[PDB]
Write a protein that binds this ligand. Structure first.
Ligand SMILES: O=C(O)c1ccc(C(=O)OCCCCO)cc1
Ligand SMILES: [Ca+2]
Length: 258
């Protein structure tokens, strides 16, 4: 009945590992594009289906490889994921927003045929690590068509974003680079009260927790993307009535659960 629904009924165990789909990659060379530094597209193969798309940005001084595990994890659960490299490794968060915007336009207008055949360009979301997550919040403000945004241990000097795009922010308790008291939590609190939003804080986690395989990040990022990109309400169970011992803070206005 939901034409965008993919994969068997989820289990928490299943969302901590690569999913039902084989994954291929397409390397986007830096010279092949303008507006961002190229990157890697992870996309499902062995299938004739189409899937929503996600543009993902790494953080300060980092490249696409720092989120390669997450790009492949999301792809394997049924998404087309472009993890970008930036024009300069020292680009700030608003620059990363512009480069996410170029990456989304590339997906919708300049995709390789192998990517486009697996892509429903009408259903796009964004995600990002650190300054990349700052850029995710800025692009959510500009582009109301986005289905979801997931900033991972985000960093931004701007603390105030206006968007109706549903936002789930992942904070890291022990983050000294983007302390949650100065970034993640102000971001959550200053988002509109009418916008479906969730803040989770991983116990004992560091700023680099998003840069390698992480069960909690996998569960919440897949579930948020499934819920909003696919309208797949089967993933409400992991985001609602939440009792998760991996988490040491949880905040929501609960607008995503019905
Ligand atoms: O995106 C990241 O992971 C990230 C974000 C911020 C810093 C940082 O040191 O902020 C202080 C200095 C600002 C520019 O020098 C480092 C890394
Ligand atoms: Ca602002």
């Amino acid at each position: 009945s939901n034409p965008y629904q993919r994969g068997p009924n989820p289990t928490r165990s299943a969302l901590t590992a690569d999913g039902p789909f084989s994954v291929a990659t397409y390397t986007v060379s830096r010279l092949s594009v303008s507006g961002f530094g190229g990157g890697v597209i992870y996309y499902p193969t062995g299938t004739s289906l189409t899937f929503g798309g996600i543009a993902m940005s790494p953080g300060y001084t980092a490249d696409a490889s720092s989120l390669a595990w997450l790009g492949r994890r999301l792809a394997s659960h049924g998404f087309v994921v472009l993890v970008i490299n930036t024009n300069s490794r020292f680009d700030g968060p608003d620059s990363r927003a512009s480069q996410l915007s170029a990456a989304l336009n590339y997906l919708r207008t300049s995709s390789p045929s192998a990517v486009r055949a697996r892509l429903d360009a009408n259903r796009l979301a964004v995600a990002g690590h650190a300054m990349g997550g700052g850029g995710t919040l800025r692009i959510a403000e500009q582009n109301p068509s986005l289905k979801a945004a997931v900033p991972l241990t985000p960093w931004h000097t701007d603390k105030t974003f206006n968007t109706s795009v549903p936002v789930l922010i992942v904070g890291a308790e022990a983050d000294t680079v983007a302390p949650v008291s100065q970034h993640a939590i102000p971001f959550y609190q200053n988002l509109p009260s009418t916008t479906p939003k969730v803040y989770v804080e991983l116990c004992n986690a560091s700023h680099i927790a998003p840069n390698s395989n992480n069960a909690a990040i996998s569960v919440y990022t897949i579930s948020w993307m499934k819920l909003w990109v696919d309208n797949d309400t089967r993933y409400r169970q992991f985001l609602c009535n939440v009792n998760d011992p991996a988490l040491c803070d949880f905040r929501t206005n609960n607008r995503h659960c019905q």
